Amino acid sequence: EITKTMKCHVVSKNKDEIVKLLETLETSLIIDKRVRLREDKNMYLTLVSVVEDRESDMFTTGQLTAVFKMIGKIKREGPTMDKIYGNGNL
Amino acid sequence: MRAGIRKALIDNIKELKGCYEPNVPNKDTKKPYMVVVQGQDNDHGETIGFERSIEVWIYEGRTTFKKLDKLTKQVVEVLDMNTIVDESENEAFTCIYKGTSENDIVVEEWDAIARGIRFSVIALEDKEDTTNDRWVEALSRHTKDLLEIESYKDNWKKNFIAPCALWRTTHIENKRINYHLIEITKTMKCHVVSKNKDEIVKLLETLETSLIIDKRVRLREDKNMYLTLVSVVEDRESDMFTTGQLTAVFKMIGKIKREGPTMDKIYGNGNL
Amino acid sequence: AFTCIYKGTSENDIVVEEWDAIARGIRFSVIALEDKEDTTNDRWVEALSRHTKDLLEIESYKDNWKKNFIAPCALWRTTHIENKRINYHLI
Amino acid sequence: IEEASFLNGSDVVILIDGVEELYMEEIKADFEQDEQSIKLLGCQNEISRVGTTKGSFSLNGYKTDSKFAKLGFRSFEIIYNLSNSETLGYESIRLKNCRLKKLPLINSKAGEIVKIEVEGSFRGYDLLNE
Amino acid sequence: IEEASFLNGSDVVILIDGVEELYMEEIKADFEQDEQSIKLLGCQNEISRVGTTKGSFSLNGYKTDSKFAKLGFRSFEIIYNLSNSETLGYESIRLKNCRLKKLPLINSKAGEIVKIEVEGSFRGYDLLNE
Amino acid sequence: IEEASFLNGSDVVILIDGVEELYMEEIKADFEQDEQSIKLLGCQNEISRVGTTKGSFSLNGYKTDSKFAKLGFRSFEIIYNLSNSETLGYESIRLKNCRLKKLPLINSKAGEIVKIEVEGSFRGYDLLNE
Amino acid sequence: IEEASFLNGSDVVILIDGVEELYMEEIKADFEQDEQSIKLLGCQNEISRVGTTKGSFSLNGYKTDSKFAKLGFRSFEIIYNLSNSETLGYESIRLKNCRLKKLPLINSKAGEIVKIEVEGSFRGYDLLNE
Amino acid sequence: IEEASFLNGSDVVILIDGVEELYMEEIKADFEQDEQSIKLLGCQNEISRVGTTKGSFSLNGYKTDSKFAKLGFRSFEIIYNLSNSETLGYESIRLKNCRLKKLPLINSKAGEIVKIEVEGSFRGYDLLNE
């Protein structure tokens, strides 16, 4: 399991635009509860929690804090029993 | 360290006319020329040791500041994190870019403009790069083998070769879990330095994945010891040099080395 | 006796033209000027300092640093004490 | 490193008695059976058999209507679509003849949100998809 | 994104035996029934039936009078108006022939506020509104 | 906004066997009764009746004497005055023929204050005031 | 100071019914037996005997398929390889004729990851390796 | 102020079936007995007697081998040397004919260290030293 608490900024001359952009971004992240890691679509980043702190600085800190997790699988393999054979005696 | 910085500046810069010491150059010296001024040496903690501060004061003929800005970018390119060898001392170092002087001054009596670039050096008093922490040795060996970069031990050395890693122990917790067993726990933090920050991210990613998929580390090449991982965590916001990005917790269980005689042969007789 | 400790260097590497000289100020310090005893009425500190000296074969200063400490050395001060009457007869 | 997936519990879609129920929060259902442990007269290992089966289920969610109170002890069906979106292989299970063990008429605390908890039994189950 | 609503628990209004009781804090009531599980001689799925029903309820709230102590084990009615104000569709339930299981004469701790807890049973229920 | 009041639990005054007991910390008392649930042969709603009543009580407080140990299993009365001072309408209840279920001879932990806990039963109760 | 080792629980590899199951998180299994305590007529020490044995097991892990729901109450084998890598002496145990006590059709909460819990019994065990 | 001593639990040394077991973490053992309470026809104080005795024990520790699984329900001895080093008066107790109540074949969680828990009974005990 790989977890990342990724924070996001939104900059603009119009602060109301910052509020609107953060609102739509949060709503998108919530209603679509995961994100395509790559265009191949095999991987995904299931959301855990998205939180905004409007008081936080626009440039240094960043308004929106999101936590994503992903579950890898150890890439081990081995030979397979395609064919089985046996005889009978007494 | 004056000789090394002066030689590097003279060799790798061609607009430069000369790199002097503080009060050397006469008024007829040909501009642009640089001046290397050493600053304090301050104890900045266990991991960094003593940190020298060095300034490189560029000077120019008061034509325009764009020439000086170009020269400043050249100096930053030359000295930032590139290992430099001081032939006089016959020991190397690695300057680190830190900033710029308070303003971009103008000196009318000399008919010049100046700007002070601000460098620093790490771990002035460290010369060993050895440790008696066997765990740090084991993980530094593991990092060097996995990652094929330098792997310094408990404290930086003044001539570190970027990119590199540094493994150190911050906290140790021993515990007598049983009569015969003792548990030794260490929360060991790791640095990754490089000029390319994306390279830092990639190196940390591969190191973390290696530590996770291989859940233990060979303490010695003789085997029979292992550092079973407990938790490995990266804090990308943490400073590259002072703190270190990656925090790992390892534990090991010893055994009290007591022994006694053995009943190899037993004998007895019967009566009535 | 005393034991100076290296601490750093002057603010810059000054140049004094009127004297025709250059100067640099190294910065040392000394510890525990007003301590001269190296004794303690804390029996526990005495016991562990004795244990450290026997096990480790280095100096073991008891209550606080003394100005002439011999590196390498150890010190075994106590920070915090908590007493507790667990029972009528026991503490 | 090849991918994996956890079926997130927020993908559940429960259709109770046909209509899609959208306030349910957690659902449980198990198919019990009496072990019928038998001690043989010669063998020292106990033997277990299917016996007879019995269903049991439960649901918890935010109250928004008197649906369950008005439903009474009437039999009804439950569908449970545990959708998976990382891989599209959803899972659907049907519970047959669901009947409430106890009608939750009233349950509320003053300083809290009103939630409805249900528990009962079902005659049999069907695994429509997997 | 269309609206929704949860029934906040502070909207409950309980009229006990006609008079409006205004110190009650949480109320619970369920309509139990014996499952009467029957194992058929040919079918391996157990069958459940209504059996017989049994009521049970409870209330907790701040004590302000000896109302319940003086009431004794007399039968009485309980109304429970779970008002909804975001949507005006309130819900009202009547519990018939409520009788206390145990009279809470005294319950108090020195360093705390005195609360009264009640539990009992009711013969039947009516769903007046929903 | 008109006032209200909570009966603070520190207003309790307990007179045990006449003498005022001033170290008691929390007192509980309930009047139980067997429900005597009866299933009618034609009606599917169970019916409850008074049956027979039974008392039970308890007290906890700081130990200061061997009063309860010396009292033994003797019958005694308990008064409980839940005074209200915001409104002067105090409440007083009498428990008749209180008898200890178990004599608490010894209870003490070394690092703690010694407290005495009692539990028993009472034949009947009287509601002197409310 | 000579070494030691703890068998880390993440080294477990469970093959259920032949196929390697890779989402299982914790597995338990015990071999019970009735003590058959007998009181002798002359000796004051009770005596215990083997009686008859009974198996019981359990598994918990992240749900990824309807494997157990579709498996039903069919008998099956379980292998459990508690690998040790500090010393290469792994341990392998086989559980014979495993049968589920209850089929976990549905278990899920909205705000959580879906996990599957199983419990059952097994006729006998084999200790393949140690 | 004269000294005292607490027998630290890390001084325990357990030899199970002769061989010194060095991964055990906590051990419990008690010698039970049926009280055989008898009510006399004239005296109002109940009388207790020895009845018959029964042993019971338990151990928990880190798993390192299949010792207990391979041991089966065979009888065995346990020694328990609660050494004291502040005063050299160690204590040794022998448990006779220890037999497991349940064989702990498998117990492990993925994210944790594997521990082995055992419980059983013993015919009798001997107090070798004190």
Residue numbers in the entry:
A (entry chain d): 183 to 272
B (entry chain R): 1 to 272
C (entry chain P): 92 to 182
D (entry chain C), E (entry chain D), F (entry chain E), G (entry chain B), H (entry chain A): 7 to 136
Original authors' sentences:
Here, we reveal the extended and contracted atomic structures of an intact contractile-tailed phage (φCD508) that binds to and penetrates the protective S-layer of the Gram-positive human pathogen Clostridioides difficile. The virion can be divided into five distinct regions: the head, neck, tail, baseplate, and needle. Structures of purified φCD508 virions in both extended and contracted conformations were determined by single-particle EM of frozen-hydrated samples; the resolution ranged from 2.6 to 4.0 Å for the extended phage, and 2.9 to 4.2 Å for the contracted form.
The neck links the capsid to the tail. The portal in turn connects to the neck, which is made up of three protein complexes with a VIRFAM type I neck arrangement, comprising one dodecameric ring (gp50) and two hexameric rings (gp51 and gp53). The symmetry is therefore reduced from 12-fold down to 6-fold, traveling down the neck. The first complex in the neck is the head-to-tail adaptor gp50, which assembles into a 12-fold symmetric ring and acts to resolve a symmetry mismatch between the portal and the tail. The neck valve protein gp51 forms a hexameric complex and represents the narrowest constriction in the neck lumen, ∼23 Å in diameter at its minimum. gp51 has structural homology to the “stopper” protein of SPP1, which is proposed to prevent DNA leakage from the capsid (RMSD ∼8 Å for 53 out of 80 Cɑ pairs). In our structure, strong density in the lumen of the channel weakens around the neck valve, suggesting the neck valve may also constitute the point at which DNA is prevented from exiting through the tail of the φCD508 before contraction. Below the constriction, a weaker density is present, which likely constitutes the tape measure protein gp59, although the enforced sixfold symmetry in the reconstruction prevents identification or building of a model into this region.
